[PDB]
Design a protein around this ligand. Structure first.
Ligand code: PRO
Ligand code: PRO
Lengths: 237, 237
């Protein structure tokens, strides 16, 4: 009868918790651990000076890291000396100032930790991206530079949604922008049902969107201000 | 001249360290963290008794986990009451005793920690596999059961070797059996050049196999008794 929608919501919610707990959180945690391992290989002295030293070394490293972190688009460091080192090849103007860019700014105002930006447009070719960034420092809080990676979580998104026919799984940020989704063309754009943000009450839950006839389970991520959404259209086997 | 082989070995060694440090160790660490998250969801009471309770729940969980841990073949628990719960579907004899199997035995003699077996043959269909296992306990060291996963690291192996044309990357265990390799048919079998085990001096190094004209870099893994081998045939661009 209608108890079908009972077991169905509790299952959709259980799958959302399990996916969050054993896939999403371990995936992000490793990516951020790998980020910190790359970051710790960076010596301030190589980048607090007018010219960059030992760059051939970091670009050799970064090419290798990108080769196994499939969500990454660029790995780079901008410096307070307006230097910019980047793999792969990226060109910018001479009016380009790294220090004014959102990854540089967010990282500077949270020294000692990494931080994820809102989606923003690449300075040169305009592409939507998201950055994870951390400030490089030297002494009494002198920010000599900022290390960051541009990412588009399409590989992550595909693995999240691999086993999911019928439903789909998405992740949204604090403002409803799509961090992960089965369709690459929706990434980093606003979510399709913005009213859902006001239904994400508490750390998790389930509800039914009578407007789009979709069951919606949601779980909040602990260390990031994001929400995992499991969606099951009332079109169901 | 011959200084080509100089920069070449130091580069092959540098790539081996970087791959070990930023890919292999974070990959294994997440897999073992995900293992422990699955393991901690297991309540002794469900499995220290003649019959298993709430099995529909664990098989619902395990199907989901397998769906995102691509190296896994089976997820299971055997009990000291000779019960066996397993996803996906696995049949055995009535002469099957989990307690005598290598994952059960290794896990029982290292309670409180996880452990990787040597490669061994599936009881029923004979297939070569490797297991990660941990004992489930209750009080003064009563081993009520053992939780374990069968794995074949082909997905891991493909990601390790994705970016590598020219050379290849492999991982061997304490006894030279192949844990990871570009060719799936070599997995879990003895390495092709067993003499290399005696050249893996110390925590890392490089040497040249004059017999197979291959440069060989090696790095030992910290928390596992294994070796990462980067091989570059003297056939080179
Ligand atoms: O647009 C930016 O600010 C960053 C810099 C490197 C690539 N994208
Ligand atoms: O052969 C064994 O012992 C294990 C048990 C489950 C599947 N393979």
């Amino acid at each position: 009868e209608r108890s079908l929608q009972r077991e169905l919501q509790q299952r959709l919610l259980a799958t959302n918790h399990q996916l969050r707990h054993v896939f999403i959180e371990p995936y992000l945690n490793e990516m951020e651990r790998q980020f910190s391992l790359i970051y710790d290989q960076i010596k301030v002295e190589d980048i607090s000076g007018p010219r960059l030293r030992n760059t051939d070394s970091y670009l050799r490293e970064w090419r290798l890291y990108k080769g196994v972190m499939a969500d990454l688009i660029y790995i780079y460091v901008g410096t307070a000396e307006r230097q910019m080192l980047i793999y792969p090849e990226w060109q910018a103007d001479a009016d380009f100032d790294p220090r004014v860019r959102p990854w540089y700014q967010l990282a500077s105002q949270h020294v000692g930790k990494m931080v994820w930006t809102e989606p923003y447009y690449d300075y040169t070719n305009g592409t939507l991206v998201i950055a994870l960034a951390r400030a490089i420092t030297d002494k009494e809080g002198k920010v000599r530079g900022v290390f960051a990676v541009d990412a588009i979580l399409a590989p992550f998104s595909a693995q999240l949604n691999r086993q999911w026919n019928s439903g789909y799984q998405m992740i949204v940020n604090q403002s409803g922008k799509v961090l992960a989704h089965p369709d690459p063309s929706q990434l980093l754009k606003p979510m399709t049902h913005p009213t859902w943000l006001s239904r994400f009450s508490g750390e998790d839950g389930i509800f039914l969107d009578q407007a789009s006839r979709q069951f919606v389970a949601y779980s909040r991520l602990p260390d990031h201000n994001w929400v995992l959404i499991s969606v099951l259209p009332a079109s169901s086997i």
